[PDB]
Design a protein around this ligand. Structure first.
Ligand SMILES: *[C@@H]1O[C@H](CO)[C@@H](O[C@@H]2O[C@H](CO)[C@@H](O)[C@H](O)[C@H]2NC(C)=O)[C@H](O)[C@H]1NC(C)=O
Ligand SMILES: *[C@@H]1O[C@H](CO)[C@@H](O[C@@H]2O[C@H](CO)[C@@H](O)[C@H](O)[C@H]2NC(C)=O)[C@H](O)[C@H]1NC(C)=O
Ligand SMILES: *[C@@H]1O[C@H](CO)[C@@H](O[C@@H]2O[C@H](CO)[C@@H](O)[C@H](O)[C@H]2NC(C)=O)[C@H](O)[C@H]1NC(C)=O
Ligand SMILES: *[C@@H]1O[C@H](CO)[C@@H](O[C@@H]2O[C@H](CO)[C@@H](O)[C@H](O)[C@H]2NC(C)=O)[C@H](O)[C@H]1NC(C)=O
Ligand SMILES: *[C@@H]1O[C@H](CO)[C@@H](O[C@@H]2O[C@H](CO)[C@@H](O)[C@H](O)[C@H]2NC(C)=O)[C@H](O)[C@H]1NC(C)=O
Ligand SMILES: *[C@@H]1O[C@H](CO)[C@@H](O)[C@H](O)[C@H]1NC(C)=O
Ligand SMILES: *[C@@H]1O[C@H](CO)[C@@H](O)[C@H](O)[C@H]1NC(C)=O
Lengths: 49, 170, 50, 99, 50
C-alpha cells in the first residue's frame, strides 16, 4: 500500500469509465436498451419517443 | 417505502450508487482533512505543572483544568460563538481529541520550541526560545533579554485584547 | 438481432445451449449463426478520432 | 514541506502518472541535558553568544552551536558585549577568555 | 476501542536547562504525489447513438 495515491486515481478513473459503459445497459424507461432493437421493432413516431 | 417507485428506479441503473459513492468520498475526505491539519505530532506533550515561563502568560490558550471539556478559555469562547434518507455521519475525531491535539501542539511549541516538529522534543527555556525567534527575524538576543518584562507585558495584554475582541465581535 | 461489425472466426468454447455472447455494455459480442450452427465473433468496425 | 526533519536535499523519481520525492532530511538524536544561561557576566559587562548558546556540564561553562553539541571556550571572538549585568534576568558569573 | 492519539511524552521543562543533540540521523523519506490522469476522450454522438 505504499503507492496507494496513484492507484487511487487509476482506480477512480477506471471505475468512472466502467460506470459510463454500464449505463448503456439501462433502458431508462424505454422498451429496450438496444437502439437497433427499437429501430427494427417500431415505426418512427413511437421509435422517436 | 413505495415498491413500484423502486421498480421504476431500477430502470435508471446505478445513479444511486454513484451518488452514495461521491458522498462517501466527501465523507472520508473530511476525516482526511482533519487528520492532515491536527494530527501533525505523534507524541502527546503536556506542560509542566509550574507555569514559570519568565513572565509570559499562556492561561488563555492552555487548557482549563476546571472545565470538563479540557478546553482553553479562548477555545471555549470559540465553541460558544458557533451555533427522508438523510443521515449525518459523526466526525472521526471528537472535539475532545482535537482539543487534545491542540493542547499537545501548544505544549510542544511552549516547552520545546520548533525542535519537536523536526525530531525529538528538546526542552529550552521560553525566554531563550523567544531570543532565538528574535534572531530569526534579524534582531539581536540582547534586545530581547534587556526588554523581557516589557515584551511579556505586551504579549499578555495582546492575548487579553484577542479574547476581548473575540468576545465583543459577532 | 441487428448490428454492424466484422464477423471473424473465434476460439470461445460455447456450450450447446449457449447461442450468443454479451459484453459489459450488454451489446452482443459473439453470435451463433443459424443453419450452420457455427460460432461467429462480432468485432466493431475500426473507428477513431481525426 | 520537504519531509520530516531539517531538510537537506531531495531526489525526484518518476512514477506512473505521478512523481516520487526522496526527501533527505537531518534528524537530531542522542540529546543530553545541560544547564544554560542567557548571558555571561564578566568585568561588569554582559556577554551574549553571536550564533550559539551557553551551556554548562556542571562545573565549566562553554558555548556551542544550537543543533549539535560542540563545546568551545567562551571567548570574545564568539561573544558580543551589550550592557551591564544588572538588567538581564538569569545572568551568571563566568570568566571570558581573551585570545 | 477508543483510539489513542499518541504515545504520551512529558517534556522535562525547567527555566535553566536545555537539551542539545550530540548526534544525528540522516533520514530519507518518500513522498508520492499524483501528476496527471489517463487522457480519456468520449465521442458523445457515438456514445449516445452509435
Ligand atoms: C495569567 O493570566 C491569568 C488571566 O489573566 C491571571 O489570572 C487572574 O488572576 C487575578 C489575580 O490572581 C484574578 O483576579 C483574575 O480573576 C484571574 N483571571 C482569570 C481569568 O482567572 C493570572 O494571575 C496570570 N498569572 C499567572 C502566573 O498565571
Ligand atoms: C566539564 O567539561 C570540562 C572540559 O572537558 C571538564 O574538565 C576536564 O575534566 C577532565 C577530567 O577530570 C580533566 O582531565 C581536565 O583537566 C579538565 N579540564 C579542565 C580545563 O579543567 C570537566 O571535568 C567537566 N565536568 C563534568 C562534571 O563533566
Ligand atoms: C556575580 O558577580 C557580582 C560582581 O562580582 C556579584 O555582585 C556582588 O555581590 C556581593 C554580595 O552578593 C556584593 O557585596 C557586591 O557589592 C556585588 N557587586 C556588584 C558589582 O554588584 C554577584 O553577587 C555575583 N553573583 C554570583 C551568583 O556569584
Ligand atoms: C533531563 O533531566 C530530566 C529531569 O532530571 C529527565 O526527565 C526525567 O526522565 C526520567 C527518565 O526518562 C523520567 O522517569 C522522569 O519522570 C523525568 N522527569 C521529568 C520531570 O520529566 C530527562 O530525561 C533528562 N534528559 C536526558 C536526555 O537525559
Ligand atoms: C552517532 O551515531 C552513529 C550511528 O547513528 C554511531 O555510529 C555507530 O557507532 C557504533 C559504535 O562505535 C558502531 O558499532 C556502529 O557501526 C556505528 N554506526 C555507523 C552507521 O557507523 C556513532 O558512534 C555515534 N557517535 C556518537 C559520538 O555518539
Ligand atoms: C437448417 O437449420 C437447422 C437448424 O436450425 C440445421 O440443423 C440444418 O442442418 C439446416 N439445414 C440447412 C440445409 O442449412
Ligand atoms: C528559575 O526558577 C528558580 C526556582 O525554581 C529560581 O530560583 C531562579 O531564579 C529562576 N531562574 C530564572 C532565570 O528565572
Amino acid at each position: 500500500s505504499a503507492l496507494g495515491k496513484l492507484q487511487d486515481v487509476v482506480n477512480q478513473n477506471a471505475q468512472a469509465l466502467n460506470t459510463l459503459v454500464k449505463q448503456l445497459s439501462s433502458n431508462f424507461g424505454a422498451i429496450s436498451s438496444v437502439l437497433n432493437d427499437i429501430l427494427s421493432r417500431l415505426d418512427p413516431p413511437e421509435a422517436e419517443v | 417505502d413505495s415498491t413500484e417507485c423502486s421498480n421504476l428506479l431500477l430502470q435508471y441503473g446505478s445513479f444511486c450508487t454513484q451518488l452514495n459513492r461521491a458522498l462517501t468520498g466527501i465523507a472520508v475526505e473530511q476525516d482526511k482533512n482533519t487528520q492532515e491539519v491536527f494530527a501533525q505530532v505523534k507524541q502527546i506533550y503536556k506542560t509542566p505543572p509550574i507555569k514559570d515561563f519568565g513572565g509570559f502568560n499562556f492561561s488563555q490558550i492552555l487548557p482549563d483544568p476546571s472545565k470538563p471539556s479540557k478546553r482553553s478559555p479562548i477555545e471555549d469562547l470559540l465553541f460558544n460563538k458557533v451555533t427522508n434518507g438523510l443521515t449525518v455521519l459523526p466526525p472521526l475525531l471528537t472535539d475532545e481529541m482535537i482539543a487534545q491535539y491542540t493542547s499537545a501542539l501548544l505544549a510542544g511549541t511552549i516547552t520545546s520550541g520548533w525542535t519537536f516538529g523536526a525530531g525529538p522534543a528538546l526542552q529550552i527555556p521560553f525566554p531563550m526560545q523567544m531570543a532565538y525567534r528574535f534572531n530569526g527575524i534579524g534582531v539581536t538576543q540582547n534586545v530581547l533579554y534587556e526588554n523581557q518584562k516589557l515584551i511579556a507585558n505586551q504579549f499578555n495584554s495582546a492575548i487579553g485584547k484577542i479574547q476581548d475582541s473575540l468576545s465583543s465581535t459577532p | 438481432l441487428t448490428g454492424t461489425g466484422v464477423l471473424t472466426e473465434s476460439n470461445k468454447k460455447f456450450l450447446p445451449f449457449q447461442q450468443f455472447g454479451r459484453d459489459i455494455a450488454d451489446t452482443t459480442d459473439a453470435v451463433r449463426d443459424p443453419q450452420t450452427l457455427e460460432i461467429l465473433d462480432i468485432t466493431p468496425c475500426s473507428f477513431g478520432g481525426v | 514541506f520537504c519531509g520530516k526533519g531539517y531538510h537537506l536535499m531531495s531526489f525526484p523519481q518518476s512514477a506512473p502518472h505521478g512523481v516520487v520525492f526522496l526527501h533527505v532530511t537531518y534528524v537530531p538524536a542522542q540529546e543530553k541535558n545541560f544547564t544554560t544561561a542567557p548571558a555571561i557576566c564578566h568585568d561588569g559587562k554582559a556577554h551574549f553568544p553571536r550564533e550559539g548558546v551557553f551551556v554548562s556540564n556542571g562545573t565549566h561553562w562553554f558555548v556551542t552551536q544550537r543543533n549539535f553539541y560542540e563545546p568551545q571556550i567562551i571567548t570574545t571572538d564568539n561573544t558580543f558585549v551589550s550592557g551591564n549585568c544588572d538588567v538581564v534576568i538569569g545572568i551568571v558569573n563566568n570568566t571570558v577568555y581573551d585570545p | 476501542y477508543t483510539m489513542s492519539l499518541g504515545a504520551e511524552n512529558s517534556v522535562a521543562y525547567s527555566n535553566n536547562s536545555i537539551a542539545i543533540p550530540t548526534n544525528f540521523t540522516i533520514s530519507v523519506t518518500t513522498e508520492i504525489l499524483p501528476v496527471s490522469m489517463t487522457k480519456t476522450s468520449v465521442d458523445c454522438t457515438m456514445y449516445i447513438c452509435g
